[PDB]
C-alpha cells in the first residue's frame, strides 16, 4: 500500500445524490441500536463507513436517560457499515472519548479521542488500532477537535484543535500527524476569530477546512492547509449567503476577516466546498434553530463578499430537525475527480424534543452528481411518540 | 478476476428443488427482521445473497404500521446471507431507494437504486461499492426498475427501466453499463405494449426477461436482449397459459404481439425460462389474487400460441400467500449448463392480512434439477393471530 | 488445498475432556435464539461448527410452540460458531430440510439436507455452497439420513440413507460422493437389520459408523466401509454392554449379527469408537428414557460376545436429559493421531417437560485425553420454570 | 510468521492514558450482554481483544440470579472485540471451564480452562483453537489459574498454577508450554508463601509476575521467570507500599521475603510494573473493600523495603467499585520499547449490591504515556436501581 495523494480537484457539482441514510432511530425503536450524536462519515481505501460518539446506552434502554450531557465516561468513537444503524453488535469502537476526527492516509487509519475532565482533558492519537501518541490540555478548558474526518496527504494528516474559552478568544492549534506521531504543531494564524469543529476536504490545491465560530460570527471561518509545507491561512467565508445556526437574516456585504454579528456564543458544525465556480455552501434552512438543510450554489463564495446564490438544493425540510454537517470524499473512487460529499445529522429527543428524556439522531449523508438531479427531502423518519 | 461471459447454455429442467428459504416472518415475531418486501436472489462469484427493499423498520417495532406503502424515504436495498433472515445486525445496505436491481458481472458488482418524489426520481448506479453513474427522471412519472437481478456479458449489463404511466402508454428504456458507467440507452422497441419489472436471466443465445404489463395484458411481455450488439426486441409469450395476476382463465390461442385482454391496470412481477422443449412458466394458482404458485413445463411457450403444460410442481399451495417472483442463477457454478432458478415472495400482512398495520414477506427459492424430484409445498409459515 | 487422507490410527483414549458446550436453553431464554434438535459438530481445515436443524423460529417466540413435530418446511441445516449458541445473527444456513449430514473433504463441505413429504422425500447434495446432485425417494417412506457429521478419504465421502419403515425391514442405501457428485450407490448388506443414523468416524483402518435399529434391536448395528474400493459390511456390537434406548438390562453374551430383543419400534441415535482395546461405547445411563450418559471402555466390543467394562466416565448426571449422540474428529489437527470426539444433545421441553409448549435442546461435546482426568458432569443448566 | 521475543524494554511511565471501557453493564440492562467476571485483555500480532469468564446467561435473563458462584459447569473463557461489551452474537468462546489463561506467542494462540468439581478437576490447554494437552489436579482441592493473560518469549509460553488450600499451604507449579505441548514444569521455589491468580508481563529482562498471597499476605508475591532456562525465582514486594485488598495501613518498612501480616483467607487480583525507578504499583483506594483503584509510582518498590510513592493517578474513585485487576501489552506494537498497560474489573451487583440477584462487571483499561496527562475517574456507569 502506499500513501494517498490529493491529486485530482473537484467534481462539478451539478446536484446532489442520495449516499447513506441509517434510519438509526425508526430502527432503534425496537432494536439494540447506541445513543449517539456527532457523527459523521470517513472512508478506507476499500470500504466507507459511518462513525459517531457513543453515549454507552441503547435507546430503549434506561441509561439513555440524560443523553443530552456532551462529556462523560461513557461515550467513544464509533464505526459502523455503511447505512447500517449504530447497534452494540456491529459497532467497532475506535478510541473512548467525547470529541473526536478520524482518517485513513492510504496505509491505515488514525483516530483520536479526547477525554477528561474540563480542566484535565487529553488526545490519544491512534494509528492502526494502537495508541501511539499524546497531547495534554494546554489551556485547561475542554480541549476539542472536529468531529468529523481528517485529510491526508502522503502520509501528513492535518487536524485542527482548539482548547480554551467557546465564548471568547480560544487556543487553536493545528497538529500534523504522520503515522499517529507529531510532525509539527502550529497556533492559529490570520484572521480567524474563533474556531471549533473544523470540517475539512483535501484536493489538488491543498486541505480546506469550514469551521464555527461560536463567539460572535455567524458567518463560518475557513482554514486552508498545505499540507506539504505544514502552513495554513485562516479567514472567514466572504458571502453574505450566512451558514452558521443561529444566524442573522443574509445581508447583501459579508465578511471575509471578522465575524459577521447578530449572534453570539452559539453555533453549528457545518461545512462547504470552496472551489471558484463550483463553490457550494451548506446550511440549516431555519436562522433561529437546527432544522432543515439546504445546499446552495455560490459562485466564489470564499472571496466574494457580494456572493449570492444561483443554484440550490433542499435535503432536508424546514419541518424537520437537522444538526451537525460534515464533508468527507471517498480518495480512493476511479475517475479523474473527488466526488464531494457531506453528511447532516438529524437529532431526535433533547432539547427540542422534550417528551423523551435521551437525545440520539440518525444520519443522511449525500454526494455530488454532475447530472441535475431532481430533490427530495430526507426526514429521520422516527415517530417521537412511539418511545412514549 | 475476469469478467463472466455467458458461455452456456440451460440445464435441462426436470424438477425443481428447494434452494433456500428464510422464514423471515415466523422469526421476525421474535427477533429483530427488517420488514421488507420486492425481494430477490443474486450471486457473487464465491457467495449466493437474499435482496430485498428494506423499509426501514423491524416488524416488532411501531414504525411497522404503515409499511403497505411501496415508496418512502426509509426504503433501501439490503443483502443478507442465504436463507437467513434480513436483521438489523446481518443485513449490508446496497444502496438508498424505493426500487432496484443488482448483479454481479465477474470482477464486482454493479447496484443501482432509485428514490424521491413521484415527479423527480432519480437512479444511482452503483459499482464496486461507490457511486459512478446517476440517471435522472425523463418522464417525471416513478422511474421504476426490475426489483430482481440483472444479468452481465463480459462486462456489459443490461437494465430494464420505466418511466410514465402505470395505466397506458410509458417510456421504457433499455440501459447498457460497464462498471457503472452508461455505454449505451434505447428506447423500447418491438411488440410488447407496457413493460415493468423485469425478471432477466442470461445463456449462450443471449439475455432473456421476463416482464408485466400493468397497462392492459395479462400474458407477459418479453424483452430479449443482445449484450454485445447492445439491442433488444420485445413481444409477448405467445402461450394460452397465461402467468400474470389477476388474469383471466386460459383460453386455446394465446397473443404474441399485443396484450391478451380482460384485466387492466394490475399485475404482479414473475418470470419464464424460455428454452424451446425446456421452457418452464411460473405462475400464482389463483386467476384472482396473489395465492399459490406453480411451474408449468410449455414446450415453446414462446412462440406457439397454442402450446399447452405437459408437466408441473406446485410450489406454494393456493391456500398461501404469494407474491412477487423472478429469475436469477449461479453463473459461477460447476458444470457444463446454467441451472436455473427462481424465487418468490411471500407476502404477509396487508392489504389481505389486515388485523396487523404492516406488510411484510419471507423468501422461497427453489433451482433446477435434471431428476424428477417429488414434490412439496413451502408456505412462509407465520401465523398472523400471534402478532396481535 | 488437497483432499484429507485418513493415515492415522486414533489416539490412545484414557479419559474425556471437555470440548465445548453452548449453553443455548439458558441463554435462549433472554436472547434470539434458535430452536433446533439433532445437533452435531464437525470440522473444517481452519475451523470446528457445532451444527444442528433449525425450527426456523427462536425460543421465547410464540411460533415455538408445536416444535415437538420433526418434519415441517421451516427446518434447515445452520452451523455457528464453536459454543456460542445457534442464534438468528451467528447462524449460517447450509441446506434446507429436517435430515442433515454434512462433512469437509479437506478442500470444500459437502452438506446434504432431505425435504419433502413422507411419500414424496428428497436429497439435495450440496458441495462448496452449491447445489450439485439431487436423490429423489426409493421408497416413498420418509427418506432419512445420519444426522451427524460423514467422513471423507481422498474426496470420497460415503453417506448412508435410510428409506422405508421404521418398524420393519427398510431400503437402506450407502452413497459415495466426490465434490458433491453420486459416484455410486449400493444396497445395505451383511447382518445388521436395521439401520438408522448413522454416526461415523474415519482412521486408517477405513470409516467406522455405528448406528440405531430403530425395529427390533437394543444393541447396535455397526456399518464398515471401505471409501477406496466403495464396500462395506455390516453387522452389531457383539458385546452385551447395550447401548440403544430404550433397552433391556445388560445380559452376559451379547449378539453380533441380530438384533437383541426386548425393546420394538424405538431407539435413539448414538455412537461407539470400535478399535480393539482402546474400545469405548457411549451410552444413556437410563434404560428407559434419554436421560445421563457415560462413556464405557469396553476391550472388543465389536468382536466379543461376552466383552464388560474395564473403566468408565460419566458424562451427564442420570438426573439431567440427554439425547442423541454422535462422533466427530478434527482431522486436520496436528500429531500422530486422530483424537476421537463426541456431543450430546441435551434435550429440553416436550415431551418430558411438557410445561412449555416447545422442544429444543443445548450441546455438550468431548474429545478424548491420554491423561487419566478427573471426571465432572455437565447437564444443560436451563431451569424450565423461567419460561412459564 | 515469527515467534514473539521480548526484545525490548519498557516505556518511561509517566502517565496513564485511557485505552479501552466496554460499559458493559449500562449497555446489558437492554441489549444481550453476557454475565461475565474475571476479565482480561490480550493481544494478538493483528487485533486486541477483551477476555473473561462467562456464566452462560445474559444479565437481563433470568439465569443471572445465583452469578456470585465462581465455579459452574455454564462458565467458558469468551473474547470479543476491544472496547465492545461482551455479547451473545460477538463473543468467541476459547475454551470451556472457570478459571482460564490466554496468550499469543506470535505464530498462534494458546488459551487453558480448568473446569471439574472442586476434588477432580483439570486443565485442558487449546493452541491454534485446538485442544492439545490436559493436566489433571494434582491436590484435589480448585486447580486454577492466573485469570489474566500469560507472556511468551520464542516460542516458550511459561503459566503459574495453584492447586490445594486458599488458606493454608498450597501446590503451585509453573508450567512451561510450546505450541500447547507441555515442555516443563517446576514446584515453586523462593520465598513466596503463597500464589493465586499472577498477572504477568515480559521484557527483555525475563517475565514478571505479580500475584495474590490469599493466605497471611497483603503485600504481593512476585515470581520471576526465565523463560530461556526455564527457571524461577519467587519473593514479595518489598516496599510498604501494600497492594492487596482487604490489607492493613502503610507502614514504614514491608517485607521482602515473608507475607506482611494484618488480614488472613482474602485477597484480590492485581498487578505491579516492576522496573527500577520506573515503578508502578496498583491497588484499590479502600483498605477495606474491592472500590476505587489508583496507580502509585514507587521507585524499586520491588526491592526496597522503605520505598514510597513519589507520583500516581486516580483510576477509579474510591465512591465507585472495582475488583480485579491485572497486566497486558502490546507485544506486536511499532516502536523501541513496550507500553505497559492493565485493565481493571469493575464489579457491579453482589454481594455489595445485593438488590439484583446477578453478579457481573464491565472492563476499563489503561496504558502508559510518557506524557504528563491529566487524569479522569472511571465508574462502570450503570445504575443499579434500573435493573430493579
Ligand atoms: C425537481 O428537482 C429540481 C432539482 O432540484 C428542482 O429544480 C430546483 O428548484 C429549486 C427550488 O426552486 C432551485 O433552488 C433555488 O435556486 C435559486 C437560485 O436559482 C434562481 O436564481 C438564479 C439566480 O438569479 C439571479 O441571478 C442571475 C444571474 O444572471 C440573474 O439572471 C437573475 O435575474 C437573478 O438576478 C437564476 O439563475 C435561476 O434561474 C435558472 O434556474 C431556474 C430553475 O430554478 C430556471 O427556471 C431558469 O430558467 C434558470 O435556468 C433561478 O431563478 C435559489 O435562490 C433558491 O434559494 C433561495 O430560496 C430558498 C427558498 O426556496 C431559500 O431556502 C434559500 O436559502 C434561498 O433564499 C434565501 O437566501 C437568499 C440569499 O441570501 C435570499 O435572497 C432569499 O431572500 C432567502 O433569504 C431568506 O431565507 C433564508 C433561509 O431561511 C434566510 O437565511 C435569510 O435570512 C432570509 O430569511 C433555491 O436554492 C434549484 O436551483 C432548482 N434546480 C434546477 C437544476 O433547476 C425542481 O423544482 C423539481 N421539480 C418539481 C416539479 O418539483
Ligand atoms: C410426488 O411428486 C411428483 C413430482 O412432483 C408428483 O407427480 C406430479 O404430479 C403433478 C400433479 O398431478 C403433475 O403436475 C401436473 O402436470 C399436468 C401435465 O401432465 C399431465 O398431462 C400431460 C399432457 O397430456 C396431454 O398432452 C399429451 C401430449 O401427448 C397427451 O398424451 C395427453 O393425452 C394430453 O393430451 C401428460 O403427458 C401427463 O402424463 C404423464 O405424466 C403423468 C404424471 O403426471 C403420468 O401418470 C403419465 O403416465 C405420463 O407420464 C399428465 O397427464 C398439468 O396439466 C397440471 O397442471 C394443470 O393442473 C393443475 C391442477 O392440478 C393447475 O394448477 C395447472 O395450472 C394446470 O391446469 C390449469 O391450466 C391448464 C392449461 O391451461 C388448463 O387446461 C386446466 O384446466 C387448468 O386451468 C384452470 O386452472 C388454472 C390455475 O388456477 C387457471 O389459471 C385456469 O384459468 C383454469 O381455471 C399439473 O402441473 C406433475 O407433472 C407430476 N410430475 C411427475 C414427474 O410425474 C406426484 O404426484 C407425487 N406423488 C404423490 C403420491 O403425491
Ligand atoms: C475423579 O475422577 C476419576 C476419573 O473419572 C474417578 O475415577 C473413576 O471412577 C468411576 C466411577 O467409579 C469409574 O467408572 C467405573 O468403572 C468401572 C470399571 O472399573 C472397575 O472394574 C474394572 C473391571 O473389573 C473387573 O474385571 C477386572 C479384569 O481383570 C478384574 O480385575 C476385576 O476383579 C473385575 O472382574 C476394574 O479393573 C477397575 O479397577 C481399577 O480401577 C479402579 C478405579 O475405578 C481402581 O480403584 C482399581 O485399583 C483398578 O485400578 C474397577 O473396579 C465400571 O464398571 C463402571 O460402570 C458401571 O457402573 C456404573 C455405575 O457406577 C454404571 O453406570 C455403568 O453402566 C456400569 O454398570 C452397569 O453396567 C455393567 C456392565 O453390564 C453391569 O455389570 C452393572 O451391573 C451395571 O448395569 C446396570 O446399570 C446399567 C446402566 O444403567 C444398565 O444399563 C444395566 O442394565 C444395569 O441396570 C464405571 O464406569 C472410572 O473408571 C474411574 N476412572 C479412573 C481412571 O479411575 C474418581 O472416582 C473421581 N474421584 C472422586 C473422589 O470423585
Ligand atoms: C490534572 O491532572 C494531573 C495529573 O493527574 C493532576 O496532578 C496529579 O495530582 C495527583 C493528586 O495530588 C498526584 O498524585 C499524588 O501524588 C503524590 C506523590 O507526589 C507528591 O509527593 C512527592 C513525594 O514527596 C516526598 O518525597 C520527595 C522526594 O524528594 C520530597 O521532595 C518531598 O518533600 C516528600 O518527602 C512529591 O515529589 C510531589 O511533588 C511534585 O509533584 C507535585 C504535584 O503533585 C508538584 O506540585 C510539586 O511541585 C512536585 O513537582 C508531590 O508532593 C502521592 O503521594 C499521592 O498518593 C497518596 O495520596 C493519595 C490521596 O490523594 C492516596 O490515595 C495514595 O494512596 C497516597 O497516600 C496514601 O499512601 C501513602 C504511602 O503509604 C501514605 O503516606 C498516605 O498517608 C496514604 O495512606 C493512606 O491511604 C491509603 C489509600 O487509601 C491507605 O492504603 C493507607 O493505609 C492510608 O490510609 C497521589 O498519588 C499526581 O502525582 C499529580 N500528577 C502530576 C503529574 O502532577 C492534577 O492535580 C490535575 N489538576 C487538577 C486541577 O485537577
Ligand atoms: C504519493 O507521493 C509519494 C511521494 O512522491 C510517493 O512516494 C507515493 O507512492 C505516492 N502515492 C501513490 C498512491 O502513488
Ligand atoms: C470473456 O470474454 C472476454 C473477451 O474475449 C475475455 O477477455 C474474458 O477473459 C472472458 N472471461 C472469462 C471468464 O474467461
Ligand atoms: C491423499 O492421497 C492422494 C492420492 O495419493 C494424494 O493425491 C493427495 O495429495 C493426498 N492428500 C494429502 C493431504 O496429502
Ligand atoms: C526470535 O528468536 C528466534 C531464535 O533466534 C528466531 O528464530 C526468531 O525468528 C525470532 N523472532 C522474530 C520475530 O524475529
Ligand atoms: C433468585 O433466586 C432466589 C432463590 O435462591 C429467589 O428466592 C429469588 O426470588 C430469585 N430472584 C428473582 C428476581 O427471581
Ligand atoms: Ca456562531
Ligand atoms: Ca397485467
Ligand atoms: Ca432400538
Ligand atoms: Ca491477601
Redesign the interface.
Known amino acids: 500500500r502506499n500513501f494517498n495523494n490529493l491529486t485530482k480537484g473537484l467534481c462539478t457539482i451539478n446536484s446532489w ?5 441509517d ?1 438509526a432511530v ?2 432503534g ?6 445513543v449517539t450524536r456527532e457523527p459523521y462519515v470517513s472512508c478506507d481505501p476499500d ?2 463507513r459511518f462513525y459517531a460518539l457513543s453515549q ?3 435507546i ?4 439513555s436517560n440524560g443523553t443530552i450531557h456532551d462529556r ?3 461515550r ?1 468513537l464509533i464505526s459502523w ?5 449504530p ?7 475506535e ?3 467525547w470529541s473526536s476526527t478520524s482518517c485513513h492516509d492510504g496505509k491505515s487509519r488514525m483516530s483520536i ?1 479526547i ?3 474540563n ?4 488526545a ?1 492519537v491512534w494509528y492502526n ?4 501518541a ?4 494546554w489551556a485547561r478548558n475542554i480541549l476539542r477537535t472536529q468531529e468529523s474526518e481528517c485529510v491526508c496527504h502522503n502520509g501528513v494528516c492535518p487536524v485542527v484543535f482548539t482548547d480554551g474559552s467557546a465564548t471568547g478568544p480560544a487556543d487553536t492549534r493545528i497538529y500534523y500527524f504522520k ?1 499517529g506521531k507529531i510532525l509539527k504543531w502550529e497556533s492559529l494564524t490570520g484572521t480567524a476569530k474563533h474556531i471549533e469543529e473544523c470540517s475539512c476536504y483535501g484536493e489538488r490545491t491543498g486541505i480546506t477546512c469550514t469551521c464555527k465560530d461560536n463567539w460572535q460570527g455567524s458567518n463560518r471561518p475557513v482554514i486552508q492547509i498545505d499540507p506539504v509545507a505544514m502552513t495554513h491561512t485562516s479567514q472567514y467565508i466572504c458571502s453574505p449567503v450566512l451558514t452558521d445556526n443561529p444566524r442573522p437574516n443574509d445581508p447583501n456585504i459579508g465578511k471575509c476577516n471578522d465575524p459577521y454579528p447578530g449572534n453570539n456564543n452559539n453555533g453549528v458544525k457545518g461545512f462547504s466546498y470552496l472551489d471558484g465556480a463550483n463553490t457550494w455552501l451548506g446550511r440549516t434552512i431555519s436562522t433561529a434553530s437546527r432544522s432543515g438543510y439546504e445546499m446552495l450554489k455560490v459562485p466564489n463564495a470564499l472571496t466574494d463578499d457580494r456572493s449570492k446564490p444561483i443554484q440550490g438544493q433542499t435535503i432536508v425540510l424546514n419541518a424537520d430537525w437537522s444538526g451537525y454537517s460534515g464533508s468527507f470524499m ?1 480518495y480512493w ?2 475517475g479523474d475527480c473527488y ?1 464531494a460529499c457531506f453528511y447532516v445529522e438529524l437529532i431526535r429527543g433533547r432539547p427540542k424534543e422534550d417528551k423523551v428524556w435521551w437525545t440520539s439522531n440518525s444520519i443522511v449523508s449525500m ?1 455530488s ?1 454532475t ?9 429521520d ?3 417521537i411518540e ?1 418511545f412514549l
Do not use: M
Open positions: 445524490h442520495i449516499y447513506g441514510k434510519n425508526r430502527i425503536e425496537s432494536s439494540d441500536v447506541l470500504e466507507c454507552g446506552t441503547t430503549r434502554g434506561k441509561h462523560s465516561q461513557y467513544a457499515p455503511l447505512s447500517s444503524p447497534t452494540v453488535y456491529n459497532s467497532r469502537v478510541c473512548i472519548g479521542c477525554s477528561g475532565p480542566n484535565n482533558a487529553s490519544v488500532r494502537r495508541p501511539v499524546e497531547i495534554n490540555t503515522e471517498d473512487a476511479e466526488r454526494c452528481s447530472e441535475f438531479l431532481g430533490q427530495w427531502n430526507w426526514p423518519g422516527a415517530k412511539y
